[PDB]
Every structure is written in C-alpha cells, then in structure tokens.
Coordinates of N, CA and C in Angstrom, one line a residue:
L1 N 47.3 -7.2 -20.9 CA 46.3 -7.2 -20.0 C 45.0 -7.6 -20.7
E2 N 44.2 -8.4 -20.0 CA 43.0 -9.2 -20.5 C 42.0 -8.0 -20.4
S3 N 40.9 -7.9 -21.5 CA 40.0 -7.1 -21.6 C 38.8 -7.4 -20.7
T4 N 38.1 -6.6 -20.2 CA 36.9 -6.9 -19.2 C 35.6 -6.3 -19.8
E5 N 34.5 -6.9 -19.5 CA 33.2 -6.5 -19.9 C 32.1 -7.0 -19.1
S6 N 31.3 -6.2 -18.6 CA 30.2 -6.7 -17.7 C 29.0 -5.9 -18.0
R7 N 27.8 -6.4 -17.5 CA 26.5 -5.7 -17.5 C 25.8 -6.0 -16.0
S8 N 25.5 -4.9 -15.4 CA 25.0 -5.0 -14.1 C 23.7 -4.3 -13.9
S9 N 22.7 -5.0 -13.6 CA 21.4 -4.3 -13.5 C 20.8 -4.5 -12.1
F10 N 20.2 -3.5 -11.6 CA 19.8 -3.2 -10.2 C 18.3 -2.6 -10.3
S11 N 17.3 -3.5 -10.1 CA 15.9 -2.9 -10.3 C 15.2 -3.1 -8.8
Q12 N 14.2 -2.1 -8.5 CA 13.6 -2.0 -7.3 C 12.1 -1.9 -7.6
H13 N 11.2 -2.9 -7.4 CA 9.7 -2.8 -7.5 C 9.1 -2.6 -6.1
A14 N 8.5 -1.4 -6.0 CA 7.8 -1.0 -4.8 C 6.2 -0.9 -5.1
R15 N 5.6 -1.2 -4.0 CA 4.1 -1.2 -4.1 C 3.6 -0.8 -2.7
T16 N 2.8 0.2 -2.4 CA 2.4 0.7 -1.2 C 1.0 0.9 -1.1
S17 N 0.2 0.5 -0.2 CA -1.0 0.7 0.4 C -1.0 1.3 1.7
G18 N -2.0 2.1 2.3 CA -2.0 2.6 3.5 C -0.9 3.6 3.8
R19 N -0.5 3.7 5.1 CA 0.2 4.8 5.6 C 1.8 4.5 5.5
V20 N 2.3 3.2 5.7 CA 3.5 2.7 5.8 C 4.1 2.0 4.5
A21 N 5.3 2.6 4.1 CA 5.8 1.9 2.7 C 7.3 1.3 3.2
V22 N 7.6 0.4 2.5 CA 9.1 -0.3 2.7 C 9.9 0.6 1.9
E23 N 10.6 1.5 2.7 CA 11.2 2.7 2.0 C 12.7 2.2 1.3
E24 N 13.5 1.4 2.3 CA 14.7 1.0 1.9 C 14.9 -0.3 2.3
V25 N 15.7 -1.3 1.5 CA 16.0 -2.7 1.8 C 17.8 -2.5 1.6
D26 N 18.4 -3.2 2.5 CA 19.8 -3.3 2.5 C 20.0 -4.5 1.4
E27 N 21.1 -4.5 0.4 CA 21.7 -5.4 -0.3 C 22.4 -6.4 0.5
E28 N 22.9 -5.8 1.5 CA 23.8 -6.6 2.4 C 23.2 -7.4 3.6
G29 N 22.0 -7.5 3.6 CA 21.0 -8.1 4.5 C 20.9 -7.6 5.8
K30 N 21.5 -6.4 6.1 CA 21.6 -5.7 7.6 C 20.4 -4.9 7.8
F31 N 19.5 -4.6 7.1 CA 18.3 -3.8 7.7 C 17.3 -3.8 6.7
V32 N 16.1 -3.4 7.3 CA 14.9 -3.1 6.5 C 14.2 -1.8 7.1
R33 N 14.0 -0.8 6.2 CA 13.6 0.6 6.7 C 12.2 0.9 6.3
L34 N 11.3 1.2 7.3 CA 9.8 1.4 6.8 C 9.6 2.9 7.2
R35 N 8.7 3.6 6.4 CA 8.5 4.8 6.6 C 7.0 5.2 6.6
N36 N 6.4 5.9 7.7 CA 5.1 6.4 7.6 C 5.1 7.8 6.9
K37 N 4.3 7.4 5.6 CA 4.4 8.6 4.6 C 3.1 9.5 4.9
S38 N 2.3 9.1 5.8 CA 1.1 10.0 6.0 C 1.1 11.0 7.2
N39 N 0.2 11.7 7.4 CA 0.2 12.8 8.5 C -0.6 12.2 9.8
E40 N -0.7 10.7 9.6 CA -1.3 10.1 11.0 C -0.3 9.0 11.6
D41 N -0.5 8.7 12.7 CA 0.3 7.7 13.3 C -0.2 6.5 13.1
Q42 N 0.6 5.4 12.9 CA 0.0 4.0 12.4 C 0.3 3.0 13.5
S43 N -0.6 2.4 14.1 CA -0.3 1.2 15.1 C 0.2 0.1 14.3
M44 N 1.2 -0.4 14.6 CA 1.6 -1.7 13.9 C 2.0 -2.9 14.9
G45 N 1.0 -2.9 16.0 CA 1.2 -4.0 17.0 C 0.8 -5.2 16.5
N46 N 1.8 -6.3 16.4 CA 1.9 -7.5 15.9 C 1.9 -7.8 14.4
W47 N 2.2 -6.6 13.7 CA 2.5 -6.6 12.3 C 3.6 -7.5 11.8
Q48 N 3.8 -7.9 10.7 CA 5.0 -8.8 10.4 C 5.5 -8.2 9.1
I49 N 7.0 -8.6 8.9 CA 7.6 -8.4 7.8 C 7.9 -9.9 7.3
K50 N 7.5 -10.0 6.1 CA 7.9 -11.2 5.4 C 9.0 -11.2 4.3
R51 N 10.2 -11.9 4.3 CA 11.1 -11.7 3.5 C 11.5 -12.9 2.6
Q52 N 11.4 -13.0 1.3 CA 11.5 -14.1 0.4 C 12.6 -13.9 -0.4
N53 N 13.7 -14.6 0.0 CA 14.9 -14.4 -0.9 C 15.1 -15.5 -1.9
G54 N 14.6 -15.2 -3.1 CA 14.6 -16.4 -4.1 C 13.5 -17.4 -3.5
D55 N 14.2 -18.6 -3.5 CA 13.4 -19.9 -3.3 C 13.9 -20.2 -1.8
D56 N 14.5 -19.5 -1.1 CA 14.9 -19.7 0.2 C 13.7 -19.8 1.1
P57 N 13.8 -20.6 2.3 CA 12.5 -20.6 3.1 C 12.4 -19.1 3.7
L58 N 10.9 -19.0 3.7 CA 10.6 -17.5 4.2 C 11.0 -17.2 5.7
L59 N 11.6 -16.0 5.7 CA 11.8 -15.5 7.0 C 10.7 -14.5 7.4
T60 N 10.2 -14.6 8.7 CA 9.2 -13.6 9.1 C 9.5 -12.8 10.4
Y61 N 9.7 -11.7 10.4 CA 9.8 -10.8 11.6 C 8.4 -10.3 12.2
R62 N 8.4 -10.4 13.5 CA 7.2 -9.9 14.1 C 7.6 -8.7 14.9
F63 N 6.7 -7.5 14.8 CA 6.8 -6.3 15.5 C 6.3 -6.7 17.0
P64 N 6.5 -5.9 18.0 CA 6.3 -6.0 19.3 C 4.8 -6.0 19.3
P65 N 3.9 -6.4 20.4 CA 2.7 -6.4 20.3 C 2.1 -5.0 20.4
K66 N 2.8 -4.2 20.9 CA 2.3 -2.6 20.9 C 3.5 -1.9 20.3
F67 N 3.1 -1.1 19.2 CA 4.2 -0.6 18.5 C 3.5 0.5 17.6
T68 N 3.9 1.7 17.6 CA 3.4 2.8 16.8 C 4.5 3.4 16.0
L69 N 4.1 3.6 14.7 CA 5.0 4.4 13.8 C 4.5 5.6 13.8
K70 N 4.9 6.8 14.2 CA 4.3 8.0 14.1 C 4.3 8.6 12.9
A71 N 3.6 9.6 12.6 CA 3.5 10.3 11.3 C 4.7 10.8 10.9
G72 N 5.1 10.6 9.5 CA 6.4 11.0 9.0 C 7.8 10.3 9.5
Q73 N 7.7 9.2 10.4 CA 8.7 8.8 11.2 C 9.1 7.5 10.4
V74 N 10.5 7.1 10.6 CA 11.0 5.9 10.2 C 11.3 4.9 11.1
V75 N 11.1 3.7 10.9 CA 11.7 2.7 11.8 C 12.5 1.7 11.0
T76 N 13.7 1.4 11.5 CA 14.7 0.5 10.9 C 15.0 -0.8 11.7
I77 N 14.5 -1.9 11.0 CA 14.7 -3.3 11.9 C 15.9 -3.9 11.2
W78 N 16.9 -4.1 12.3 CA 18.2 -4.7 12.1 C 18.1 -5.9 12.2
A79 N 18.8 -6.8 11.3 CA 19.2 -8.1 11.8 C 20.4 -8.2 12.7
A80 N 20.5 -9.4 13.5 CA 21.2 -9.5 14.7 C 22.7 -9.2 14.2
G81 N 23.0 -9.7 13.2 CA 24.4 -9.8 12.8 C 25.0 -8.3 12.4
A82 N 24.0 -7.3 12.2 CA 24.6 -6.0 11.8 C 25.2 -5.3 13.0
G83 N 25.2 -5.6 14.2 CA 25.8 -4.9 15.2 C 25.2 -3.6 15.7
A84 N 23.8 -3.6 15.3 CA 23.2 -2.2 15.7 C 22.8 -2.4 17.2
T85 N 22.3 -1.1 17.6 CA 21.9 -1.0 18.9 C 20.4 -0.9 18.9
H86 N 19.6 -1.8 19.7 CA 18.3 -1.7 19.8 C 17.8 -0.4 20.5
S87 N 17.1 0.5 19.9 CA 16.9 1.9 20.3 C 15.5 2.1 19.8
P88 N 14.4 1.7 20.3 CA 13.1 2.1 19.8 C 12.8 3.5 20.1
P89 N 11.8 4.3 19.2 CA 11.1 3.7 18.2 C 11.9 3.8 16.7
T90 N 12.8 4.1 16.8 CA 13.7 4.2 15.3 C 14.5 3.2 14.8
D91 N 15.0 2.4 15.8 CA 15.9 1.2 15.5 C 15.4 -0.2 16.5
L92 N 15.0 -1.1 15.7 CA 14.7 -2.3 16.5 C 15.6 -3.5 15.8
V93 N 16.0 -4.5 17.0 CA 17.0 -5.2 16.4 C 16.2 -6.7 16.5
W94 N 16.2 -7.3 15.3 CA 15.6 -8.7 15.2 C 16.8 -9.8 15.7
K95 N 16.5 -10.4 17.1 CA 17.4 -10.9 17.7 C 17.7 -12.4 16.9
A96 N 16.5 -13.0 16.6 CA 16.5 -14.3 16.1 C 17.1 -14.6 14.7
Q97 N 17.2 -13.7 14.1 CA 17.7 -13.8 12.7 C 19.1 -12.8 12.5
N98 N 20.1 -13.8 12.1 CA 21.2 -13.0 11.8 C 21.5 -12.1 10.7
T99 N 20.9 -12.4 9.7 CA 21.0 -11.6 8.4 C 19.3 -11.5 7.8
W100 N 19.0 -10.5 7.1 CA 18.0 -10.5 6.4 C 17.9 -11.4 5.0
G101 N 19.1 -11.8 4.8 CA 19.3 -12.6 3.5 C 19.9 -11.8 2.6
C102 N 21.0 -12.5 1.9 CA 21.7 -11.8 0.5 C 21.3 -12.6 -0.6
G103 N 21.4 -12.3 -1.6 CA 21.0 -12.6 -3.0 C 20.6 -11.7 -4.1
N104 N 20.3 -12.4 -5.3 CA 19.8 -11.7 -6.5 C 18.5 -11.2 -6.6
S105 N 17.7 -11.8 -5.5 CA 16.3 -11.6 -5.6 C 15.7 -11.5 -4.1
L106 N 15.5 -10.3 -3.6 CA 15.0 -10.0 -2.3 C 13.8 -9.4 -2.2
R107 N 12.7 -10.0 -1.7 CA 11.2 -9.7 -1.7 C 11.1 -9.4 -0.1
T108 N 10.7 -8.1 0.2 CA 10.3 -7.7 1.6 C 8.9 -7.2 1.7
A109 N 8.0 -7.8 2.3 CA 6.7 -7.4 2.3 C 6.1 -7.0 3.8
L110 N 5.5 -6.0 4.0 CA 5.0 -5.7 5.3 C 3.3 -6.2 5.5
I111 N 3.1 -6.9 6.4 CA 1.9 -7.5 6.7 C 1.3 -6.7 8.1
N112 N 0.2 -6.8 7.9 CA -0.7 -6.1 9.1 C -1.0 -7.2 10.0
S113 N -2.0 -6.7 11.0 CA -2.2 -7.5 12.0 C -3.1 -8.6 11.7
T114 N -3.8 -8.4 10.6 CA -4.8 -9.4 10.1 C -4.3 -10.4 8.9
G115 N -3.0 -10.2 8.6 CA -2.6 -11.2 7.8 C -2.5 -10.6 6.3
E116 N -2.6 -9.4 6.0 CA -2.9 -8.9 4.6 C -1.6 -8.1 4.3
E117 N -1.0 -8.3 3.2 CA 0.2 -7.4 2.8 C -0.3 -6.1 2.2
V118 N 0.3 -5.1 2.8 CA 0.0 -3.8 2.7 C 0.9 -2.9 1.8
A119 N 2.3 -3.5 2.0 CA 3.3 -2.9 1.1 C 4.6 -3.9 0.9
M120 N 5.3 -3.5 -0.1 CA 6.4 -4.3 -0.3 C 7.4 -3.4 -1.2
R121 N 8.5 -4.3 -1.2 CA 9.8 -3.7 -2.2 C 10.6 -4.9 -2.4
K122 N 10.8 -5.1 -3.6 CA 11.5 -6.2 -4.3 C 12.8 -5.8 -4.9
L123 N 14.0 -6.2 -4.5 CA 15.4 -6.0 -5.0 C 15.7 -7.1 -6.0
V124 N 16.2 -6.7 -7.2 CA 16.6 -7.8 -8.2 C 18.0 -7.1 -8.7
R125 N 19.0 -8.0 -8.6 CA 20.1 -7.6 -9.2 C 20.7 -8.8 -10.2
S126 N 21.0 -8.2 -11.3 CA 21.5 -9.4 -12.5 C 22.8 -8.8 -12.9
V127 N 23.6 -9.9 -13.2 CA 25.0 -9.3 -13.5 C 25.6 -10.5 -14.7
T128 N 25.8 -10.0 -15.7 CA 26.5 -10.8 -16.6 C 27.9 -10.3 -17.1
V129 N 29.0 -11.4 -17.2 CA 30.4 -11.0 -17.4 C 30.8 -11.7 -18.8
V130 N 31.3 -11.0 -19.6 CA 31.9 -11.7 -20.9 C 33.0 -12.3 -20.7
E131 N 33.1 -13.9 -21.0 CA 34.0 -14.8 -20.6 C 35.2 -14.6 -21.6

C-alpha cells in the first residue's frame, strides 16, 4: 500500500455592518444564507448579493423590489440548480443563475439599495497533497 499525506485548510472571513450578516455560504454553490441579527426589521428592496469566485466574472443577484428580512429571521437564496422550492420570505430561488459558483476562493458580499457593501463572507480552501 502506498502512503498518503495531505493538508487541507478551510478559512472563513466575515465582516458585518448594520442588521444583516452573511451567515452561511455553501461550498457546493447551492445557497447563500443571510440573517437579521438585530431586533428590528430590515427592508432589503433592490438590495444585491455580489459573488466573486476568484477571477471569475462577477455574479450579481438582486432582491425583489420590495422585501423585508424581519428581526431575527433568515433568508436563503438558492441557485436554480439546487432544486429548491421558492417560498418567501425564508427561501428565494435565483432563477437566472444555476450555481453560486464553486472554487477555492468564494467571496459573497451584501449590497444595500445605494450600492454600498454592508456585509460579506469569504470562503478559502487550500489543499496540498504529498506526491
């Protein structure tokens, strides 16, 4: 039997301002979950989620023109390929994009209605195998 050895690192860099954080990002490109961590509702009409997968072209999801993330609640935005059911206010389906994107560097940023980044979560996976 041949010997095996590997080093795998998974890092998550999160930054949050305001009421809504990027709570969880799927490594399989299926969903992005946001959470209102405050005790007040947050209107997110025409807010955006910008996804930067390494040097890939930027993917931009846009919320419905009227959408509220209530206090303490979560919303999961599913890519169209995930096979999820569109069920607001907790589950929204991004019909135009089949995947959020897979890769070793995944940056997900929440953008408010005026174009400012208010929260983000960046996933980085590094793997080295001994040859």
